[PDB]
């Protein structure tokens, strides 16, 4: 028989690329292509998604980020519309931590690493540098809560509690009150996890309080390195960056291959029912949603163009690559790469914060007691 | 002069609800709210969105009470998403819209009638304390709500002046292949006479079959389940052990037309009080498409004022999470013939059972003492 | 708060320790005036020492 | 038999049967699981042979 698939993307050149990829995968049971553009509203997007599901009767929907900088509102309408019939949906360029629990978003597949993996990356980086006292500075939000919970779990795995945790309000005009309390500790390894806007406001207060000199180390993430924060970023700050995060065509081929494998493994089962094309007609749940999702989650890809593709428990694309960047003389340069198991450094040198060539101890000895 | 809509689904006594709607008296509030009663089928969420858009663009619709006879939570999710997008206040009367979704949107205006996860745990703890039971264990599936409820119950029982004995906690996953043997081997470690279960209907049936294969469900075992484990009291999987205890929402005594009239009157009174005090009434362009620029008029004041309302000698104040403060809960039991019989009623942290002596299901002596 | 004078057996032991292991201190009294107890009242859903 | 074997609670048990019967009872007990860590079995000279 013939069964078509659907997808939603922008940059119609990318639509032509997806058509070419489908034509190439057809040489590997007949599949067709059906894609539409993006609307400037969520209700219109949901209506168009329903119309396209009625027209094509596809079993899986691919969703990517639009030209919007936030890239968080676009995943909500398509997922909310497709969750009605329990139809699986695969995401390509979604990285918000809000869509981590399966409760809110029932069916979701990922092709990039969530911000929760940054906690494990920071744990590995701190273990490589032999540190034992860290201060976690995270903004009060869902992503910040997840990054704090993952770090706390990784720390309690070794029975090592955090030195001090300070939380701030999102968009707070003044953050000097938290910095004054944080500067009255004995630890020097401070980790920052917030938005690019509050990143510069925190960096200004840190540089004004002489908290960026010698003996201090900065551990930030990808969001703290991009944006306008680099205008007020301090030297020696170590950040993170996805290998192929900016690229969107490489993940498309791997997602298409995984979906083709899942469809080949799905049509060989009994009691299989195609997704109903009666969008305005039927409002029931398709029985082919749970089993197909369970089979696609365990569909381990042998090899692809972006490395090994796997799926975690809560629908996460694991085994990602990161480039450890460093800002020296107002220019960012790579210093290493962490391929999951460990981080292998390059032949380049590292300029620590304050110009100290020697690795800082990242700790102090308290002498005045109360 | 605010127009409120009331949508019905399936078969319902609309003529009986019309009398209750007309009998509403809100002369002191001076709202003079008009009522728009509409009936619709279970076509789809797209049809629901189209009907909502038509009702809004018809004549200044400023509120909606939506009820359905189905059981899908996707309808409630789509309704919440549409209410958050259109920025208009919508309410969930009963049926599928009465389902409690875990994580509400930040910039949303939603209100439903029902208890929280912590409320069910508190009711179960009160019932267990009344039944003189003082020892129990916990078992949950891979559902995140189950883990949240377990954490809440542990935090509540930890800081208790009275005594408590917790044997162990089980987090077995039923999604693993060939792992049923390990689950059956681990279930034998249970020794307490009371056990709480947090899973879904199919998972509960599978766990009950596994326990019956083990045999720890016949005489000295008592199981407590949440309101989501039963769902429909009419259907029984015939695999649940006799004498199961579970809580549920008050659906046998509460009247649907009276509840709808009370909700409409409370919403009208709250809106009238807010428009009288703040002197700001939100009446934007009621259109569905092109709603990105419709957020020029913020409606956070109506959401802030909707969490405190009272009428006809009743308290209908909501919470920050979107749950009613004082709900009405019932506790039923299973008899010999598969059915649910109402045993007790709980409201305002006050329980009331229909028997001073529990039905035991010759030992169990009775002794007279002066 | 008001500066007062403190001395006794515990102060002498404290001075001996500070001399023998060479650290400094800034002693100050307790505001609550209670030895310590873990208030675990379920009213505020939190338990903490006083 | 499998339902009645679950009533055993002592850490030591003596068995008096034949080789085939002993093997069947051991399989039933392994299905029950009371033979791994805290169980000790004593058999006569005719159980091994």
UniProtKB/Swiss-Prot annotation, chain A:
NMDA is probably regulated by C-terminal phosphorylation of an isoform of NR1 by PKC. Its phosphorylated state is influenced by the formation of the NMDAR-PPP2CB complex and the NMDAR channel activity. Disulfide bonds join 50-279. Residues 1-370 are extracellular. Detected throughout the brain, in brain cortex, cerebellum, thalamus and olfactory bulb. Glycans are attached at residues 32, 174, 210, 247, 271, 321, 339. It is found in: Cell membrane; Postsynaptic cell membrane; Synaptic cell membrane; Postsynaptic density membrane. It comes from the Eukaryota. Component of N-methyl-D-aspartate (NMDA) receptors (NMDARs) that function as heterotetrameric, ligand-gated cation channels with high calcium permeability and voltage-dependent block by Mg(2+). NMDARs participate in synaptic plasticity for learning and memory formation by contributing to the long-term potentiation (LTP). Channel activation requires binding of the neurotransmitter L-glutamate to the GluN2 subunit, glycine or D-serine binding to the GluN1 subunit, plus membrane depolarization to eliminate channel inhibition by Mg(2+). Belongs to the glutamate-gated ion channel (TC 1.A.10.1) family. NR1/GRIN1 subfamily. A hydrophobic region that gives rise to the prediction of a transmembrane span does not cross the membrane, but is part of a discontinuously helical region that dips into the membrane and is probably part of the pore and of the selectivity filter. The extracellular N-terminal domain (ATD) is a site of allosteric regulation to modulate overall receptor function. Heterotetramer; the NMDAR subunits are modular and harbor tiered domains that function in concert to regulate opening and closing of the cation-selective ion channel pore. Forms heterotetrameric channels composed of two GluN1/zeta subunits (GRIN1), and two identical GluN2/epsilon subunits (GRIN2A, GRIN2B, GRIN2C or GRIN2D) or GluN3 subunits (GRIN3A or GRIN3B) (in vitro). Can also form heterotetrameric channels that contain at least two GluN1 subunits and at least two different GluN2 subunits (or a combination of one GluN2 and one GluN3 subunits) (in vitro). This is Glutamate receptor ionotropic, NMDA 1. It comes from Rattus norvegicus. The lineage of its organism: Eukaryota, Metazoa, Chordata, Craniata, Vertebrata.
From Swiss-Prot, chain D:
It comes from Rattus norvegicus. It comes from the Eukaryota. It is found in: Cell membrane; Postsynaptic cell membrane; Late endosome; Lysosome. The chain holds residues 216 to 264 of 1482 of the full protein. Phosphorylated on tyrosine residues. Component of N-methyl-D-aspartate (NMDA) receptors (NMDARs) that function as heterotetrameric, ligand-gated cation channels with high calcium permeability and voltage-dependent block by Mg(2+). Participates in synaptic plasticity for learning and memory formation by contributing to the long-term depression (LTD) of hippocampus membrane currents. Channel activation requires binding of the neurotransmitter L-glutamate to the GluN2 subunit, glycine or D-serine binding to the GluN1 subunit, plus membrane depolarization to eliminate channel inhibition by Mg(2+). Belongs to the glutamate-gated ion channel (TC 1.A.10.1) family. NR2B/GRIN2B subfamily. Heterotetramer. Forms heterotetrameric channels composed of two GluN1/zeta subunits (GRIN1), and two identical GluN2/epsilon subunits (GRIN2A, GRIN2B, GRIN2C or GRIN2D) or GluN3 subunits (GRIN3A or GRIN3B) (in vitro). Can also form heterotetrameric channels that contain at least two GluN1 subunits and at least two different GluN2 subunits (or a combination of one GluN2 and one GluN3 subunits) (in vitro). In vivo, the subunit composition may depend on the expression levels of the different subunits. Found in a complex with GRIN1, GRIN3A and PPP2CB. Found in a complex with GRIN1 and GRIN3B. This is Glutamate receptor ionotropic, NMDA 2B. The extracellular N-terminal domain (ATD/NTD) endows NMDARs with a unique capacity for allosteric modulation, harboring several binding sites for small molecule ligands that act as subunit-specific allosteric modulators of ion channel activity. A hydrophobic region that gives rise to the prediction of a transmembrane span does not cross the membrane, but is part of a discontinuously helical region that dips into the membrane and is probably part of the pore and of the selectivity filter. Expressed in the hippocampus including the dentate gyrus (at protein level). Detected in adult olfactory bulb, brain cortex, hippocampus, striatum, thalamus, superior colliculus, with much lower levels in inferior colliculus, midbrain and cerebellum.
